[PDB]
Amino acid sequence: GVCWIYYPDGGSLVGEVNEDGEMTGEKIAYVYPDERTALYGKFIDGEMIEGKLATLMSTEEGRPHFELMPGNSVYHFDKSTSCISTNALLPDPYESERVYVAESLISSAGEGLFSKVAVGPNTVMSFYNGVRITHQEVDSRDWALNGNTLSLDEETVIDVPEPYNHVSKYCASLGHKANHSFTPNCIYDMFVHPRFGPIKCIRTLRAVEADEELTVAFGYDHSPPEAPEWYQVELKAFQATQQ
């Protein structure tokens, strides 16, 4: 029979496991956190070799039944390295139905990230993929090159370096396009992605309305205030509104 294996983030691998008990076969799927959008096809040991975009229409005796989307929407396990993606311009189909990039409502923030649709709290909205570099590197260079750096764990930083900060040059993920707020409606949270691998995602903390801008706390060290000058500014301002 069927096995589902959930990641802590709510995504899952589902399928009949093989003789040796591995997520291996032609009819395995990764199902996104909405429990509707899925990537269906060939996996070996839980790695997506060839996943075709599908909708989960229902389950019978716990067995998922998918409808393929028209096209040849194929996706592949593609962990970044110097290389952000093998398909810089191929969007995440789950992300694409949920967010879009537009001018930010925050004065001189530039661009920002918005909900296409109204969602609940705890809803994963967008992915933060990037190149995978080291803290020493990140911390050895000027802030001007550190606009999109995001701490993944204690060995790894995730970056979206110029010119991938432009959507016409990179749009496989959009998490980096979310602006900072000290009164955020989202957080960065761990996510295990079938294409990007282990990255971070952007998740709502509260219900959000269609066309609201999504914001997160960048969470730079307040006292080592090691941050760019615009953040140091918004911090003085905010703490005044607080103290």
Partner: peptide
Amino acid sequence: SKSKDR
């Protein structure tokens, strides 16, 4: 140090 969300 110089990156989001450490």
